[PDB]
Amino acid sequence: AGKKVLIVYAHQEPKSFNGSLKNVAVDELSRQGCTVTVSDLYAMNFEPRATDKDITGTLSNPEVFNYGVETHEAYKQRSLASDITDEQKKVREADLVIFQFPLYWFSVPAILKGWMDRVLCQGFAFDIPGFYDSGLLQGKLALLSVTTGGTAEMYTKTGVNGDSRYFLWPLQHGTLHFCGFKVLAPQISFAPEIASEEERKGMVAAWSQRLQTIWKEEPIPCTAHWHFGQ
Amino acid sequence: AGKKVLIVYAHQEPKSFNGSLKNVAVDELSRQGCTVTVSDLYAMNFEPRATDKDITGTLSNPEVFNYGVETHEAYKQRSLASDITDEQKKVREADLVIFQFPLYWFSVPAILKGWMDRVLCQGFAFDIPGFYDSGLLQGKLALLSVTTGGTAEMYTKTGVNGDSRYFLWPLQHGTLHFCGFKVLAPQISFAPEIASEEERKGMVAAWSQRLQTIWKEEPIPCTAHWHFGQ
Numbered sequence: 482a483g484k485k486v487l488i489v490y491a492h493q494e495p496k497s498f499n500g501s502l503k504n505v506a507v508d509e510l511s512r513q514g515c516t517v518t519v520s521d522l523y524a525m526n527f528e529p530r531a532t533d534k535d536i537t538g539t540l541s542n543p544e545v546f547n548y549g550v551e552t553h554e555a556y557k558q559r560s561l562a563s564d565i566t567d568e569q570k571k572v573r574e575a576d577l578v579i580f581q582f583p584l585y586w587f588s589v590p591a592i593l594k595g596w597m598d599r600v601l602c603q604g605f606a607f608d609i610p611g612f613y614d615s616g617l618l619q620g621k622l623a624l625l626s627v628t629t630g631g632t633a634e635m636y637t638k639t640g641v642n643g644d645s646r647y648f649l650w651p652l653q654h655g656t657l658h659f660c661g662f663k664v665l666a667p668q669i670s671f672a673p674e675i676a677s678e679e680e681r682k683g684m685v686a687a688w689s690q691r692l693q694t695i696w697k698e699e700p701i702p703c704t705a706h707w708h709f710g711q
Numbered sequence: 712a713g714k715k716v717l718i719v720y721a722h723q724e725p726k727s728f729n730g731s732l733k734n735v736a737v738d739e740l741s742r743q744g745c746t747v748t749v750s751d752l753y754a755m756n757f758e759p760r761a762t763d764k765d766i767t768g769t770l771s772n773p774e775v776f777n778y779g780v781e782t783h784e785a786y787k788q789r790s791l792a793s794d795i796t797d798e799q800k801k802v803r804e805a806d807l808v809i810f811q812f813p814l815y816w817f818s819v820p821a822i823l824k825g826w827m828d829r830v831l832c833q834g835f836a837f838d839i840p841g842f843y844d845s846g847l848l849q850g851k852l853a854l855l856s857v858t859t860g861g862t863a864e865m866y867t868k869t870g871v872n873g874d875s876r877y878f879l880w881p882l883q884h885g886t887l888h889f890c891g892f893k894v895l896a897p898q899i900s901f902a903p904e905i906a907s908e909e910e911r912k913g914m915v916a917a918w919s920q921r922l923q924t925i926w927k928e929e930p931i932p933c934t935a936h937w938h939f940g941q
């Protein structure tokens with residue numbers, strides 16, 4: 482039996498470092514005989530906005546619009562916007578979901594945040610109860626491949642940006658673990674733009690090299706302790 | 712003299728607790744005689760995607776598109792998209808910037824993240840020489856008024872979601888403090904949808920009552936210690 486992988490890619494330039502890290506992941510996982518799918522958000526012109534346009538049926542409460550309530554109802558009625566269900570198909574089938582993106586304000590670019598806001602709706606990604614360890618997407622693995630402008634030193638506890646794990650909290654714990662995902666150690670390619678042609682090559686290579694044994698990896702303990710120590 | 716306030720509002724329903732919190736802020740601050748501008752992102756159908764459309768005219772390098780470089784250059788060249796420059800005018804003129812938004816995946820809704828990604832460009836909000844305490848928007852006050860689905864106990868250090876100060880990090884420190892903003896204590900209205908009408912009123916009331924003395928407030932020490940330490 483093989484493995485299915487969904488790569489949610491968020492970058493505008495194919496020739497970029499992120500483009501390379503995404504292409505390299507495609508190459509390597511393809512080479513492994515893995516089933517690979519790529520959601521090139523910018524090319525898809527993915528709708529980041531959570532609006533009533535995401536529902537197609539009779540709103541549960543057309544007097545007072547509540548996105549969460551409405552999307553959960555739409556999901557259960559199969560009346561969500563198609564672009565959302567398409568993504569949910571990709572995720573539903575994936576064994577691993579990789580997010581390739583540059584760090585935008587200690588987080589993911591808006592287009593990617595929209596992906597998370599709209600795709601990971603109630604009923605599909607989680608239920609109440611049914612989150613964190615009980616997340617509907619339990620059994621799946623998720624990994625953040627992040628490129629940064631700041632340096633590794635800047636992202637240390639005593640660095641000006643604080644520990645790199647600090648900003649991973651909302652994405653890894655708040656979003657992924659909440660949905661049931663098991664989180665693999667993040668792949669951070671620090672300050673590519675500052676790096677030399679050689680160092681860049683090494684960063685790209687290291688990612689491919691790591692993917693060779695990605696199926697053997699254990700997930701990180703997605704806890705407050707892992708992120709903040711104490 | 713006088714105090715200018717820019718409220719960046721991100722919610723789809725006017726009749727919502729979020730709308731009420733925004734309306735109350737408008738009321739109170741307008742009553743105080745302050746200058747108030749509101750950016751109703753959803754009504755404005757604000758563009759969250761960071762693309763090459765954000766630059767008008769000839770790109771510094773159309774062969775390889777680099778958002779950060781292109782925008783920064785376009786800023787100095789006065790070639791940015793009007794929707795971005797409009798918001799920058801409001802920001803530049805404001806003394807206090809209030810962000811009113813529901814918590815979406817331990818962060819801000821994508822439409823609001825988009826505002827931050829595109830509006831707070833290099834050359835305007837920050838630049839290599841100036842960031843954090845030296846940010847280009849140094850002197851202004853910033854406040855995050857967020858509503859949560861989770862209860863106050865869930866947002867404790869040993870709670871499922873962890874301490875609320877953990878998710879605040881990328882927002883307050885990574886974004887706001889980075890741009891030079893003085894950060895005022897965040898206003899967090901825990902689980903409004905779960906609260907009673909009495910509790911909700913108490914919530915909206917404390918917010919307005921707080922607004923009565925906002926100008927006398929001391930900004931919090933936006934440090935790693937403040938968010939994670941003891």
Ligand SMILES: Cc1cc2nc3c(=O)[nH]c(=O)nc-3n(C[C@H](O)[C@H](O)[C@H](O)COP(=O)(O)OP(=O)(O)OC[C@H]3O[C@@H](n4cnc5c(N)ncnc54)[C@H](O)[C@@H]3O)c2cc1C
Nearest residue numbers: 497498499501583584585586587628629630631674681779
């Ligand atoms: C709105 C915004 C917010 C930001 N917020 C932050 C923040 O909070 N924190 C932070 O640290 N940074 C931040 N930055 C910076 C951002 O994280 C970096 O600019 C980004 O990660 C750089 O990645 P890139 O793929 O765009 O790089 P590139 O500019 O592509 O840099 C890579 C260089 O390598 C070349 N290259 C590409 N592929 C390869 C390859 N395979 N081998 C060799 N060379 C190659 C490229 O052509 C280029 O010369 C922000 C920037 C913006 C626009």
Ligand SMILES: Cc1cc2nc3c(=O)[nH]c(=O)nc-3n(C[C@H](O)[C@H](O)[C@H](O)COP(=O)(O)OP(=O)(O)OC[C@H]3O[C@@H](n4cnc5c(N)ncnc54)[C@H](O)[C@@H]3O)c2cc1C
Nearest residue numbers: 549598727728729731813814815816817858859860861911
């Ligand atoms: C994509 C997505 C991701 C999410 N991620 C998170 C997350 O990470 N963490 C988390 O905890 N939650 C999350 N939520 C949930 C969300 O944060 C909350 O449900 C939301 O903040 C509730 O605020 P509201 O203003 O929309 O509430 P409302 O639906 O408006 O609830 C307020 C209630 O008070 C009534 N009301 C309005 N005005 C007043 C007034 N003045 N006085 C009295 N009553 C009034 C309203 O009509 C309603 O009955 C997420 C939701 C979505 C859709």
Ligand SMILES: [Zn+2]
Nearest residue numbers: 654658703704
């Ligand atoms: Zn976790």
Ligand SMILES: [Zn+2]
Nearest residue numbers: 884888933934
């Ligand atoms: Zn800070």
